[PDB]
């Protein structure tokens, strides 16, 4: 038993609350969250949540961890999977019944580019997801958890708006618009900018979109290109030809220190950790 | 390259756009239809429409099949499905390319309550849908179309928002309160009253949908008990505890002899023509 949605009173009326392809755009007031734990209990829904933390990143998994064990999925399935080149640093966090942590050791790449470009081909690792998990979600670790993230997230694709662009216009997007780039974006085109933070999906939609990218960034590579902004500049590319099925809004990524916390934002559920 | 979606600029502000559980309410001013078109078209999808026209609503069709020509998903594949107990009434009506018709002989049942009704275990002729089409889509043939209805409703299961109660509050919903019946929906439950004249979805799903209200109404009848409207309280039982995907605004079930134009409509698509 739960509050009537009325067809002519809209939840929220300040912001786009659905996209032009019919994809949610998820806020705090478009969801019921007692329907939607029902319905994903209901199929047993296990979450992976994927995490780099190569060389210094290892410092941040603590609180991320924890912050997670708070926030993420709770009461929902959950595995962890923490990508580090150091094992050892992992820190034991208690976990919550249903969740697990598994630390997969990767090689260090030199530079900081190529580390957060080659996540991309890190999780692209194929069939251990697909047997483990139903859904992945694929996100920084120099972050926190402060308020509910859950299954009002989950669908085959999604991806994030970028909390620095939210409010702009198209031209101001800092996609890639070299015609050389496999992430070429024209000026006249382009829904959103998504951040390359936080993006998900079911394990093939996932395991697609990861493939995809490695393969752009590989064509880019052997051409002599580096794309603007790396991994975010081909994710934009990607669900611009495949259009995300839900879109979260941007209290799902953002930094307060930099932004406030303006009154569009009813929530911040996951922020930045100052860094160097 | 389109009108570029601004997230603080929503579309429709007076009117509800999504559902508490993350589902479009399809009204005109949400979507794009030229990037739906394309995403539909690149799977090269068929839909299937079915039409009951049994007796003398065989006059029904000339208009319905004409209009359908007109309106009903332009440019993509369709079957019609025409269930009658008259092959030889059927009008032969010119088809756009990609177009074909089936008559599908049947009996005719004695009551109009049994005619609305035998359709759930009617639609049920199970594996031909499978084969032919991607999407069934059931309607009343005393309808005509008036503009456009198209891709935008294709998901997984949708239902329509009943014309005359979209603006009421649940303990005035016409289910069906008698615990003795399957189609029993206590007072304080209920999202949305739908109408049994306007439902779909992937085959799939149409096929579990009909055989539920079939499976349900046989439990009725084997009980001494008739819901008190019949198949559509049935499809609002399983619509209660299977939630649509997608739900249709009133554009897509009107009736303007009754109901007049209101502002809140900006089309009138799918309308009920004048019977005795
Ligand atoms: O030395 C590094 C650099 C990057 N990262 C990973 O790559 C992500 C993206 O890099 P970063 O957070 O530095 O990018 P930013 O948020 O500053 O743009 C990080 O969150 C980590 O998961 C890492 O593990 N070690
Ligand atoms: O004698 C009948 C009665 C009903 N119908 C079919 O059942 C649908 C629902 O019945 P009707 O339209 O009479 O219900 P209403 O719209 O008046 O509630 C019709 O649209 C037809 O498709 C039919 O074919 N022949
Ligand atoms: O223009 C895109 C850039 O936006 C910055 O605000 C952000 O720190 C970068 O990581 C990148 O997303
Ligand atoms: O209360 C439900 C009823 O509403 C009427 O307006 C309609 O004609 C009936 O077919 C049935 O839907
Ligand atoms: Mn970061
Ligand atoms: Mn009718």
New binding site residues.
């Given amino acids: 038993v739960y509050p009537q949605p009325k067809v002519l009173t809209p939840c929220r009326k300040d912001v786009l609350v659905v996209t032009p392809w019919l994809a949610p755009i998820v806020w705090e007031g478009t969801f019921n969250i007692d329907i939607l734990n029902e319905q994903f209990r209901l199929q047993n829904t296990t979450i992976g949540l994927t995490?780099?933390?190569?060389?210094?990143?290892?410092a941040?998994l603590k609180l991320f961890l924890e912050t997670a064990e708070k926030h993420f999925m709770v009461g929902h399935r959950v595995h962890y999977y923490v990508?580090?080149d150091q094992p050892a640093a992992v820190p034991r966090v208690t976990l919550g019944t249903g969740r697990q942590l598994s630390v997969l050791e990767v090689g260090?790449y030199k530079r900081?580019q190529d580390?957060?470009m080659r996540?991309m081909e890190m999780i692209s690792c194929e069939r251990r997801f697909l047997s483990e998990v139903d859904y992945l979600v694929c996100?920084?670790?120099?972050?926190e958890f402060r308020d509910h993230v859950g299954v009002e997230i989950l669908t085959p694709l999604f991806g994030t708006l970028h909390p620095s662009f939210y409010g702009s216009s198209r031209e101001a997007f800092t996609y890639e618009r070299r015609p050389q780039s496999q992430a070429y974006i024209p000026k006249d085109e382009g829904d959103f900018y998504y951040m390359?933070?936080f993006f998900g999906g079911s394990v093939q939609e996932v395991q697609r979109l990861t493939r995809a990218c490695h393969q752009a960034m590989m064509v880019d590579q052997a051409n002599g290109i580096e794309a603007v902004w790396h991994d975010e500049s081909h994710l934009n590319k990607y669900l611009l030809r495949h259009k995300p099925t839900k879109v979260l809004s941007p209290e799902y990524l953002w930094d307060q220190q930099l932004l406030g916390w303006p009154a569009v934002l009813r929530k911040l559920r996951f922020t930045?950790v100052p860094?160097n």
Same sequence: chains 1, 2.
Avoid: H, N, P, Q
Wanted: positive net charge; aromatic residues 20%; without cysteine.
């Fill in positions: 995490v780099f933390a190569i060389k210094k990143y290892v941040f990508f580090t260090a900081w580390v957060s996540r996100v920084d670790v120099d972050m390359g933070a930045a860094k």
